[PDB]
Design a protein around this motif. Sequence first.
Motif, PDB file in Angstrom:
ATOM      1  N   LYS A   1      34.487  33.076  33.998  1.00 54.76           N
ATOM      2  CA  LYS A   1      35.371  32.706  35.100  1.00 54.76           C
ATOM      3  C   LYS A   1      35.250  31.212  35.403  1.00 54.76           C
ATOM      4  CE  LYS A   1      35.196  35.132  38.952  1.00 54.76           C
ATOM      5  NZ  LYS A   1      34.728  35.533  40.302  1.00 54.76           N
TER       6      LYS A   1
ATOM      7  N   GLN B   1      35.436  28.923  42.963  1.00 52.13           N
ATOM      8  CA  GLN B   1      35.737  30.152  42.252  1.00 52.13           C
ATOM      9  C   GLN B   1      36.373  31.164  43.192  1.00 52.13           C
ATOM     10  OE1 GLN B   1      33.188  30.660  38.397  1.00 52.13           O
ATOM     11  NE2 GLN B   1      31.872  31.028  40.173  1.00 52.13           N
ATOM     12  N   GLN B   2      37.069  32.124  42.603  1.00 51.79           N
ATOM     13  CA  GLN B   2      37.872  33.082  43.335  1.00 51.79           C
ATOM     14  C   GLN B   2      37.545  34.481  42.850  1.00 51.79           C
ATOM     15  OE1 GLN B   2      39.653  30.667  41.202  1.00 51.79           O
ATOM     16  NE2 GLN B   2      39.136  29.209  42.837  1.00 51.79           N
TER      17      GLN B   2
ATOM     18  N   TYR C   1      42.854  32.586  32.002  1.00 56.71           N
ATOM     19  CA  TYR C   1      42.722  32.646  33.452  1.00 56.71           C
ATOM     20  C   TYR C   1      43.951  32.026  34.103  1.00 56.71           C
ATOM     21  CZ  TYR C   1      37.869  33.715  32.433  1.00 56.71           C
ATOM     22  OH  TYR C   1      36.716  34.302  31.954  1.00 56.71           O
TER      23      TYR C   1
ATOM     24  N   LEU D   1      37.923  25.892  39.775  1.00 57.13           N
ATOM     25  CA  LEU D   1      39.189  25.213  40.030  1.00 57.13           C
ATOM     26  C   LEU D   1      39.011  24.205  41.155  1.00 57.13           C
ATOM     27  CD1 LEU D   1      42.293  25.128  39.315  1.00 57.13           C
ATOM     28  CD2 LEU D   1      42.606  26.630  41.287  1.00 57.13           C
TER      29      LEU D   1
ATOM     30  N   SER E   1      43.062  37.237  35.071  1.00 53.73           N
ATOM     31  CA  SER E   1      42.814  36.965  33.662  1.00 53.73           C
ATOM     32  C   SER E   1      43.411  38.056  32.787  1.00 53.73           C
ATOM     33  CB  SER E   1      41.318  36.806  33.361  1.00 53.73           C
ATOM     34  OG  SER E   1      40.678  38.065  33.245  1.00 53.73           O
TER      35      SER E   1
ATOM     36  N   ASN F   1      47.945  28.471  34.069  1.00 58.88           N
ATOM     37  CA  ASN F   1      46.898  29.185  33.338  1.00 58.88           C
ATOM     38  C   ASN F   1      46.124  28.229  32.446  1.00 58.88           C
ATOM     39  OD1 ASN F   1      49.464  29.391  31.545  1.00 58.88           O
ATOM     40  ND2 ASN F   1      47.773  29.861  30.143  1.00 58.88           N
TER      41      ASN F   1
ATOM     42  N   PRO G   1      45.149  28.749  45.585  1.00 63.89           N
ATOM     43  CA  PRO G   1      45.592  29.990  44.931  1.00 63.89           C
ATOM     44  C   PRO G   1      45.635  31.152  45.914  1.00 63.89           C
ATOM     45  CG  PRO G   1      43.278  29.593  44.455  1.00 63.89           C
ATOM     46  CD  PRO G   1      43.795  28.350  45.156  1.00 63.89           C
TER      47      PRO G   1
ATOM     48  N   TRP H   1      46.324  31.274  37.847  1.00 61.33           N
ATOM     49  CA  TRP H   1      46.415  31.201  39.301  1.00 61.33           C
ATOM     50  C   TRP H   1      47.871  31.228  39.728  1.00 61.33           C
ATOM     51  CZ3 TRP H   1      43.238  28.187  36.344  1.00 61.33           C
ATOM     52  CH2 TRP H   1      41.855  28.323  36.551  1.00 61.33           C
TER      53      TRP H   1
ATOM     54  N   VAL I   1      42.006  34.940  41.506  1.00 63.25           N
ATOM     55  CA  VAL I   1      42.297  34.485  40.149  1.00 63.25           C
ATOM     56  C   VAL I   1      42.532  35.713  39.278  1.00 63.25           C
ATOM     57  CG1 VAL I   1      39.856  34.312  39.446  1.00 63.25           C
ATOM     58  CG2 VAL I   1      41.587  32.926  38.273  1.00 63.25           C
TER      59      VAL I   1
ATOM     60  N   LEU J   1      38.147  37.654  40.919  1.00 61.97           N
ATOM     61  CA  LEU J   1      38.915  37.880  39.695  1.00 61.97           C
ATOM     62  C   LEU J   1      39.362  39.339  39.596  1.00 61.97           C
ATOM     63  CD1 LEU J   1      39.948  37.209  36.815  1.00 61.97           C
ATOM     64  CD2 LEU J   1      37.664  37.770  35.997  1.00 61.97           C
TER      65      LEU J   1
END
Length: 202
Positions: A28, A159-160, A82, A31, A69, A100, A39, A84, A67, A162
Amino acid sequence: AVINHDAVPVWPQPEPADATQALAVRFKPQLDVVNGCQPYPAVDPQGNTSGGLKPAAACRDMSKAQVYSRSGTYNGYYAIMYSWYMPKDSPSGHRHDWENVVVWLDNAASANIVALSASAHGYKKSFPADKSYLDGITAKISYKSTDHELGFTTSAGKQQPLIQWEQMTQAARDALESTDFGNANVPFKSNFQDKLVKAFFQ
Ligand SMILES: [Mg+2]
């Protein structure tokens, strides 16, 4: 159907049910949103999708972070895309934004990063992958308008939660396949392999 951009719930990150899903969790990316929207979630498990925003105070809520994927293979390499969703792409633009990055591995077992591809207006490509864009195995991505586009960065990012294409309900996958996002396009629907071709690093 289409619901308010700020009413789409964040899809919680589940435990990875198999090695495909564990690998996508492991890689992951980070961003760094330099400008523009944070996002947001684009879809819920019933298949309702975000109505976006008409062209940042309405799209800066950090609690909405998400996020996406999708994983697959192309031409002998292993790809984790990945992606957004942002409610708009308005540098001063249009409703909706889909971006992406593709993390390319030699194979899913060795899992050496061989290249990175980031969506921009085609794909920027870092091949061989520039180590200054990696925090361990965590790619460092920027989101910035100079339209808002992805790029590689040495700056630390966030990070978000996933949720993977492989973990979604069928209703969510169907909605992402069929929904008109206008100037933006879901990059991991039935076009996934076509996008990997465009992202491929030769
Ligand atoms: Mg954009």
